């Protein structure tokens with residue numbers, strides 16, 4: 092264990108010396124690609140080497156044939172994918188891939204989207220991959236509606252859903268360029284399926300709080316929305332019975348009451364704050380500040396009384 | 398659900414003497430050699446934590462100043478180490494160090510300003526370097542570097558503001574680029590940016606503050622986003638953000654302090670990401686800086702914006718107004 096790490100070091104060190112020497116001499120050639128491939132595999136965060144690779148590839152593009160240049164690009168794509176398999180969270184590796192694809196004459200974006208789906212199967216929360224997928228989706232011009240379809244499959248097939256809900260929060264406003272009530276209603280139905288499927292999944296509760304803010308306002312509740320929110324309220328109370336340590340459902344009850352009728356539900360709101368603090372005492376200070384805010388809002392409403 | 402359980406013989410006292418010893422000897426090896434690509438930042442982490450502990454004199458000022466000068470490139474930018482390439486990250490670290498040492502004219506300030514100005518894009522964003530990677534981390538590096546040099550006016554500030562605000566998300570947080578998911582480190586960079594540029598009124602402090610306080614797990618430690626393990630360096634990213642937006646009291650101070658103390662190595666000194674792991678200077682800085690934000694009387698008060706002793710920022714007269 093301890094001895095071969097000294098010999099890895101000595102190799103890394105000698106390879107690094109060698110790269111820098113070559114670079115100073117202006118030797119922008121395949122030997123540099125050879126040497127950096129040895130270092131970047133274990134050490135993809137060594138940024139200056141990704142820069143050396145780009146400098147080599149740029150230079151070679153000038154003095155090699157179209158066919159030779161195309162071969163170097165396909166080799167680069169392979170090298171990048173092997174590097175990502177070892178460390179799929181390196182900023183440098185993902186940026187190099189983007190640099191490389193952005194400068195091709197005819198990139199294969201459909202194959203890059205599949206690469207994304209493959210990495211997201213392995214780690215649904217890898218934000219580097221989601222960001223790359225966005226880049227690719229833009230470059231190709233994949234419509235929001237297809238990306239929406241992607242997200243749904245991801246949310247239902249297993250959990251670790253924060254990143255998929257986040258993407259939905261950005262896609263929905265693009266389909267409808269503050270959401271339309273009909274869209275909002277379908278979204279609420281999808282999310283409350285989630286949080287009833289897995290009540291400990293934080294992600295659906297965070298996204299549901301957003302949805303509760305993203306619509307009309309309480310003085311403008313439609314009958315259908317009013318009815319949906321009351322139904323959610325009752326559903327959260329049943330969950331509270333089944334899961335009395337669940338803090339997300341208690342907070343959400345308080346928020347639903349606010350969305351429905353702050354003054355009519357004032358007593359129950361106050362009771363729920365007490366229960367919630369006892370269930371989530373690390374959030375006591377936040378909860379007290381939220382209750383203070385809500386009480387001021389209620390004073391203002393009582394005083395708007397003609 | 399994902400959390401650590403802290404074992405009951407975990408350290409529960411602050412071992413400052415051990416930490417200073419650990420950092421003072423750190424340069425004197427595998428990780429050290431393999432992390433040369435971040436050396437300028439590593440030197441920053443060491444010097445800052447030493448100064449928070451009142452031990453900066455134990456480090457080698459003169460040698461560090463020569464090393465910084467040799468890392469300034471002809472474009473004005475600073476690299477992580479000699480022969481590496483200039484980047485905004487290391488340009489920031491360098492200027493932070495020289496600020497700690499009141500030695501800013503060791504490098505060519507005019508050229509640093511020109512290097513930063515040059516990396517701003519038409520949409521207001523900053524690239525990290527000439528190769529074009531765009532990240533709000535680099536918007537923070539650019540304005541923090543310029544603020545410390547008295548040169549914030551050198552960039553297009555309104556455009557830079559609009560870009561950072563385009564990275565605000567449904568949950569109140571910030572991502573690295575438009576449409577990127579929220580996470581603590583990015584939130585720190587963007588709130589830090591908004592403090593420096595006087596735009597904290599654009600943050601929804603109650604919504605973001607809530608997302609941040611929900612980073613605290615039953616162990617007391619903080620994660621950087623939903624459903625991840627806690628890590629002592631979130632003591633910095635999360636707390637500093639909470640402080641900038643006036644919501645530091647939304648976390649349980651005592652539970653966090655016990656988590657942070659349990660991350661210490663009682664034998665070697667240093668803090669690790671989680672109790673029992675191997676320590677490093679990165680986690681050592683953020684553990685100590687987190688304790689300082691929590692009001693630990695043996696540690697100098699730390700700026701939540703610049704992660705340096707407040708007394709340093711007082712000296713240069715750059716202390717952005719926070720929310721409260």
Ligand SMILES: CCCCCCCCCCC(=O)N[C@@H](Cc1c[nH]cn1)C(=O)N[C@@H](Cc1ccccc1)C(=O)N[C@@H](Cc1ccc(O)cc1)C(=O)N(C)CCc1ccccn1
Nearest residue numbers: 432435438439486534582583628630670677678679703704
């Ligand atoms: C001689 C010291 C050797 C230390 C040994 C190596 C450990 C350092 C490497 C730490 C690192 O890169 N960690 C990962 C994630 C992690 C956390 N805990 C354990 N692992 C990482 O990606 N860290 C990023 C996370 C982040 C992302 C976006 C925004 C903020 C934070 C990170 O800490 N980035 C910082 C600091 C940084 C700067 C240059 C580097 O080459 C590496 C890390 C960052 O990019 N910025 C802009 C923060 C600047 C800043 C201002 C004030 C105080 C501290 N930092």
Ligand SMILES: [Ca+2]
Nearest residue numbers: 454455456457
């Ligand atoms: Ca000294």
